[PDB]
From a paper:
Binding of an extracellular agonist leads to conformational changes in the receptor, triggering activation of associated signalling partners on the intracellular side of the membrane.
For both constructs, we obtained crystals using the lipidic cubic phase crystallization method in combination with the chimeric T4 [name] approach to improve the probability of obtaining well-diffracting crystals. Superposition of [name]-ELF or [name]-LF with [name]-GW5 reveals that the structures are overall similar (root mean squared deviation with values of 0.7 Å for Cα atoms, excluding T4 [name]) indicating active-like [name] conformations. In contrast to all the previously determined GPCR structures, the W3216.48 side chain in [name]-LF and [name]-ELF is oriented parallel to the lipid bilayer. In [name]-ELF, F3768.50 is no longer anchored between TM1 and TM7 but is rotated outward forming hydrophobic interactions with L371. The dose-response curves for the determination of the half maximal effective concentration of NTS on the exchange of GDP for GTPγS on Gq (EC50 values) were multiphasic (Hill slope <1) for [name]-ELF and wild-type [name], indicating high and low affinity agonist-binding sites at non-saturating G-protein concentrations. However, [name]-ELF may be more dynamic than [name]-LF, indicated by its lower thermal stability and thus higher flexibility, accounting for the observed differences of the kinetic properties of both receptor mutants.
Author numbering:
A (entry chain A): 50 to 92, 100 to 268, 297 to 384, 1002 to 1165
B (entry chain B): 8 to 13
Amino acid sequence: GPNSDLDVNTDIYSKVLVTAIYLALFVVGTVGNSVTLFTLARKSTVHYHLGSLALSDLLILLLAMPVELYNFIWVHHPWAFGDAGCRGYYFLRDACTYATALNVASLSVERYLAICHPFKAKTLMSRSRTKKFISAIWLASALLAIPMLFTMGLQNRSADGTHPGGLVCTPIVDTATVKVVIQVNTFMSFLFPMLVISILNTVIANKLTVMVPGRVQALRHGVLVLRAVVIAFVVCWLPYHVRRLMFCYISDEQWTTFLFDFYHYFYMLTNALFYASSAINPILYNLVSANFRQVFLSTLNIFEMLRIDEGLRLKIYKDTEGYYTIGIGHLLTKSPSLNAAKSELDKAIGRNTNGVITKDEAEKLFNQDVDAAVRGILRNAKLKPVYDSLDAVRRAALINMVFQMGETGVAGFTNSLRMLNNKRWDEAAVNLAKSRWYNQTPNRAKRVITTFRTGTWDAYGSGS
Amino acid sequence: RRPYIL
């Protein structure tokens, strides 16, 4: 036959398996991302990025999966969508690919700022700049896909010069360009976003762990999700860009019937995983938020520690030393004047409180104070290297001290600090337990000392 | 002989 070599040899099982899979991903991903859009619409800046991500993934399924399933899984030749179809389909495939790539990446950069740079995030961001940001990543996505309009194209590969059943869509340009094009795709669609996602997520994950049983269980799944997101990206997208690079980097000299046959099976695997990304993303990225169980499934360390040690009160009290305090250990003033406090409390939040506040207002204060303590530690020579060397749990204990006594108070524990720095847990504990601190607040200090000497939550059985 | 599909 004149096209007989363009025949792809693959098990009919295999073709029936991948099809069943493909369509399974297709409903779950079309529904999930639709329902996601339906859910997000009826609801700071993450909600738009999640929606942008939802679209980009919905489009991968609707634009890429149908033609691939006809023309790449079953009927390999001929290409039944003409030359412009060939150019339009790889363009649109690539565009959505970049959109998802740039969305996932942006979404991580967005949550990096929210949690590690909340000052900027507040003043130097809004829902205007967000939509300016999102416009840019379809604008850019569409831009980056343009090469595909010129490198792809129809071609008659049949042994005879031209026979209608041997037309194929394929890179119809020299390998010096096609290798270059495919390695820009790989770099911008995978590596750049790999570095971004893998780094920032892990940085966010670590910071979030130190920040954060029932009341904070949401945030602890969020951490696991943050790490899951990276594994998900790698596994679903790495084989896809291997196959695209293998396509162009193996020379016609080295190609063999076996390799030819391998590739087309590898195609079934790689692309099935690729479509998985779009299907799971809506579920993975929306897990952390409340209403997950609800919305999709209808369609069928420092906070805890201080919450215990400082407690929570809504009226003004006098702390251990006798100073007017409110909420989660927020010292209002050292004055003995009960009015002077009320004045400073109204100033604090910005309204005539009369010495009483709401839980939201207490938790807003807390975060400002913890921010303050952590900046305190990171900006201090005597505290940064100690903190840097400690694990998530012991870091929190160091913050408990700074929250209680201040940055320059804790800098006074010159040797107890050195000992923690050098993992001499027992010696630190004994020397810490001989302090004025320990005398004033034995219960709290002993829990904090236990935390330093164990690295566990043994002290905080009362946590909720 | 090599793949034409990408």
